[PDB]
Amino acid sequence: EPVVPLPDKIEVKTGEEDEEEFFCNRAKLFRFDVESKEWKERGIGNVKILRHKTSGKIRLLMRREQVLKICANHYISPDMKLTPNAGSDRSFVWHALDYADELPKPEQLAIRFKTPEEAALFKCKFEEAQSILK
Amino acid sequence: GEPQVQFKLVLVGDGGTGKTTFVKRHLTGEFEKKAVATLGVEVHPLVFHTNRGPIKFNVWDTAGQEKFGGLRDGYYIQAQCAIIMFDVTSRVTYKNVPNWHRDLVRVCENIPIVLCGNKVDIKDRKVKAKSIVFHRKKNLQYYDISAKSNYNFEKPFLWLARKLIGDPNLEFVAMPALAPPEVVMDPALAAQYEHDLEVAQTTALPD
Numbered sequence: 001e002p003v004v005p006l007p008d009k010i011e012v013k014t015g016e017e018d019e020e021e022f023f024c025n026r027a028k029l030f031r032f033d034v035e036s037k038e039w040k041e042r043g044i045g046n047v048k049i050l051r052h053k054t055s056g057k058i059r060l061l062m063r064r065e066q067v068l069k070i071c072a073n074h075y076i077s078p079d080m081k082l083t084p085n086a087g088s089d090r091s092f093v094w095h096a097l098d099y100a101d102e103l104p105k106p107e108q109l110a111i112r113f114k115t116p117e118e119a120a121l122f123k124c125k126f127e128e129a130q131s132i133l134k
Numbered sequence: 135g136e137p138q139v140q141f142k143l144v145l146v147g148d149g150g151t152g153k154t155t156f157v158k159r160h161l162t163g164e165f166e167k168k169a170v171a172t173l174g175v176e177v178h179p180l181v182f183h184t185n186r187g188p189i190k191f192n193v194w195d196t197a198g199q200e201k202f203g204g205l206r207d208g209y210y211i212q213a214q215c216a217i218i219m220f221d222v223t224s225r226v227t228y229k230n231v232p233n234w235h236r237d238l239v240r241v242c243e244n245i246p247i248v249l250c251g252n253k254v255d256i257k258d259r260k261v262k263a264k265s266i267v268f269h270r271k272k273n274l275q276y277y278d279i280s281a282k283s284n285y286n287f288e289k290p291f292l293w294l295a296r297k298l299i300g301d302p303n304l305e306f307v308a309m310p311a312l313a314p315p316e317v318v319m320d321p322a323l324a325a326q327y328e329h330d331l332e333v334a335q336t337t338a339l340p341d
């Protein structure tokens with residue numbers, strides 16, 4: 001029979017308040033499945049490139065729509081290579097230590113955009129982020 | 135997990151309706167194309183963030199084929215909510231919904247229950263939304279959903295969260311992006327990392 005206190009609102013803290021946006025755009029994210037040797041979908045939603053204002057580290061962060069769970073979260077490295085898929089100028093693949101699942105897990109990731117312009121802008125900013133990480 | 139707020143959620147419905155697929159879609163983001171019948175029950179945690187804090191559903195993904203399992207009346211014990219899945223492409227799965235409801239409520243009197251008509255992505259519904267009257271009774275709720283296209287895919291959980299927490303304005307909020315741990319890869323095997331990254335670049339993206 002005990003009833004319970006409507007818990008309190010907490011302030012919504014996104015974790016990005018210490019960062020600055022370099023890039024923000026909706027996209028579709030894929031994860032390469034090592035076992036089946038096929039791409040598997042990881043999420044659709046907004047990709048962001050963020051620079052910490054203090055450490056100056058720049059990471060890639062992505063959120064799934066509606067549920068707003070993280071589906072990508074890893075520091076961008078100069079060692080990274082963005083490599084378009086097939087002949088597609090709407091998509092790229094790269095290797096990363098991702099922390100979406102709150103665990104540092106190696107993944108090969110593919111990201112596809114709606115217009116080749118958006119993809120070009122993603123590449124451009126991505127590579128631009130590494131331009132300060134050399 | 136550390137959220138102090140959690141719920142037992144049992145997910146029921148005929149085999150082939152897309153229950154396990156749905157849970158998985160919430161779980162990893164993937165869309166399992168294949169049909170592998172759930173054996174009995176699989177328990178999977180789903181955490182959501184809200185303007186009132188983190189909540190967790192302990193989802194009991196039961197198999198809908200009659201044939202897999204035993205005591206499912208037993209799986210249902212102390213369940214605080216449920217989803218009943220049916221397939222809008224297959225009316226039998228909707229006509230059987232009433233037994234799922236009877237069977238659940240006789241084990242749990244007051245549970246908020248959602249009816250989901252999965253697979254609305256499929257071009258011709260044989261069971262339209264406007265034929266859905268099952269929710270009429272209070273503590274019931276219906277949604278058209280699709281695990282293929284994400285249509286309404288957060289809603290059953292939003293609604294249940296709202297019900298079980300007691301806040302009709304409760305909102306899912308952005309999962310906080312914790313700083314990713316200062317741990318990079320080992321470049322000694324970076325020599326190796328490329329070819330599987332190629333295997334990737336050699337593999338067309340579906341569509």
Ligand SMILES: Nc1nc2c(ncn2[C@@H]2O[C@H](COP(=O)(O)OP(=O)(O)NP(=O)(O)O)[C@@H](O)[C@H]2O)c(=O)[nH]1
Pocket residue numbers: 147148149150151152153154155156166167168169170171172173196197198199252253254255256279280281282283
């Ligand atoms: N077109 C389409 N197919 C879907 C959708 N959701 C699930 N499916 C398909 O439904 C089939 C059965 O999935 P599954 O989740 O295993 O059904 P189930 O209810 O778990 N079966 P069981 O009760 O026996 O475990 C799969 O082949 C999957 O591709 C959807 O939104 N659209």
Ligand SMILES: [Mg+2]
Pocket residue numbers: 153154155171172195196197198
């Ligand atoms: Mg199942």
